[PDB]
């Protein structure tokens, strides 16, 4: 509500699935990323990035209210968490990664 609103972004898919999330990202160019809202427990939202003709999906955690993709590096919320990994080389937060939140999916 004019705060941490996520639907105002283009990388936020919220009620989206894995195959669905990558549907756009896979179709989109490399670096394309998005975030969905759903899980089961050890997480809240899920981040999906198109890197290497593939879409890497991860279940964000809500540590003390902070959102984190790797759980090692978190932020205030999603925007702050997704609008930072775009600079923070995933290779440091993720694993065999070598990029960052390049582009959204609604773009």
């Amino acid at each position: 509500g004019h705060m941490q609103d996520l639907s105002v972004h283009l990388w936020y898919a919220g009620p989206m699935e894995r195959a669905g999330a990558e549907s756009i990202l896979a179709n989109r160019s490399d670096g394309t990323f998005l975030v969905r809202q759903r899980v089961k427990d050890a997480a809240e939202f899920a981040i999906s990035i198109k890197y290497n003709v593939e879409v890497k999906h991860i279940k964000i955690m809500t540590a003390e209210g902070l959102y984190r993709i790797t759980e090692k590096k978190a932020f205030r919320g999603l925007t702050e968490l997704v609008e930072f990994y775009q600079q923070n080389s995933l290779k440091d937060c993720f694993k065999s990664l070598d990029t960052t939140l390049q582009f959204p999916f609604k773009e």
Binding site: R18, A19, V39, A42, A43, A46, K56, H57, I58, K59, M61, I69, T70, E71, K72, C93, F94, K95, L97
Partner: peptide
């Protein structure tokens, strides 16, 4: 499993 975020990176090992 492969259909969901199989915890790719976070606290493995």
């Amino acid at each position: 499993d492969t259909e969901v975020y199989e915890s790719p990176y976070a606290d493995p090992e």
